[model samples]
Target: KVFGRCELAAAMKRHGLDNYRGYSLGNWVCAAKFESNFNTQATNRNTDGSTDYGILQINSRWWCNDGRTPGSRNLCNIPCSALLSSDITASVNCAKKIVSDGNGMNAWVAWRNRCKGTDVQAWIRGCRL
Candidate 1:
């Protein structure tokens, strides 16, 4: 429902990654910034098995599930409604779950390093956030 960029920023400030220490959700913001200029609910129709959909360009076919619908897969998801629904956070958490692994910042550190960087500062610059 929400369709404003400022509203999106507010959404981030309201339910953003202020919980982690050492490095905030800076890298995530960076990736999103680079991908869709930080716009949530971003969707794209591309070839199969590709990086598509959502603000972070998350692949719906690969990593999306309709919250355990009849054919829902491992991921329980809903369409990212920009800044309207709280599902955006859930989607981000889904990525976070993989990036941070079961515990610690190892996964993020590794991801940020490969495409972006492991360190917060490098990641920021990598994505130009």
Candidate 2:
């Protein structure tokens, strides 16, 4: 288990994710909450045989290879398990690469479905960033 939302936000900020590429800090926080509830070891299997990894739930189809899963584009150039680590350094980098792929935060279905157009201020409410 990782820290709470506020600490996670501060960590993200310290990792240079705060307001990155015009994306609000709240968006990342909100997405992480819904994607994995700030759990670094979170994993979810989709109906299409693709898996989501880490706090951001990055998909296997294009991001990381889980070694057992096939059809991965492996664009992130890191193993899926790396994203599941609590350190989150590799996960953060992979997530930023995903964001830079021209989709922004929309690459995350959680951001598209949950955080989009919603009031996400509470995710970073007490964070002093």
Candidate 3:
């Protein structure tokens, strides 16, 4: 499922992403926009033999285990397939863990290159929450 911008923002907020770890809801929304365009089943294979999965593009190299990413840490302890689900609960939970692990939002290069130090208010400007 591809989420609408405000829908994704509201969903992320419901899952406790609002100001999570000092990153605003807009930051998360911005990350999702560039990472997967709010697509629940998005996947991107990297040249490093790893793949990023789901809306937030959680990587198989360290987060979810796809059983094929060499030396995968599977730190999130979830099957990579689970991240592709439209439910998004698992994805949100894993993302929180990722942030809490000290990587913060920098865990995603998209966030660093696109959302870092940028005004993200527009990402969630019209969202009711």
Candidate 4:
């Protein structure tokens, strides 16, 4: 299952996150660990309680996916499913677009690379390895 927007909105505040930026990173990595089970496509219908969705594990659809809009996209697909039909960038792109309204994304792009295990040493010039 996936953590929802509601969960993430609060988690971001609790975690002292500032818009998924580069400096705001490391949180996502840790968030990816504590909040979620690292499952991109995660969704849970808890019997007692605890239904989350997305990388940030957001609950309320209003926060991210166009909030009060009808037919708004469900971001749960990010941390909700196991594998994406597209790719990491595609997933991150969508998440970024909604989360910041285009204000944030570079950091997320960086996160994508880091999550992929591409370290500074690994990211060399010309070599592009």
Best by TM-score: 3
* Tens-digit lDDT track of model 4 for 1-129: 343333433444344443454434334444443434554554443343434444544443423332333444455343333223212343344444444654443323334434434332221223211
* lDDT (C-alpha) at residue 9 in model 2: 92
Residue-wise lDDT of candidate 1 within 74-129, one digit each (tens)?
A: 44344433322435676566555444445343433323444355454443343312
RMSD values, in order shown = 6.4, 1.2, 0.8, 11.9
Q: lDDT score of model 4?
A: 0.40
- Score residue 104 of candidate 3 by CA lDDT: 92
List the candidate 2 regions with Cα displacement exceeding 4 Å: none
lDDT per residue, candidate 3, 1-129, as tens digits? 999999999999999999999999999999999999999999999999999999999999999999898787988899999999999899999999998998799998999999999999889987788
TM-scores, one per candidate:
0.50, 0.93, 0.96, 0.35
| Candidates sorted by lDDT, best first | 3, 2, 1, 4
- Candidate 2 collision pairs: none
Q: How many clashing pairs in candidate 1?
A: 3
Q: lDDT of all predictions, in order shown?
A: 0.46, 0.87, 0.93, 0.40
- Candidate 2 lDDT over 1-129, as tens digits, reads 666888899888888888888887889999998899999999999988989999999888889998767766899999899999989788889989999989899988889999989877777887787
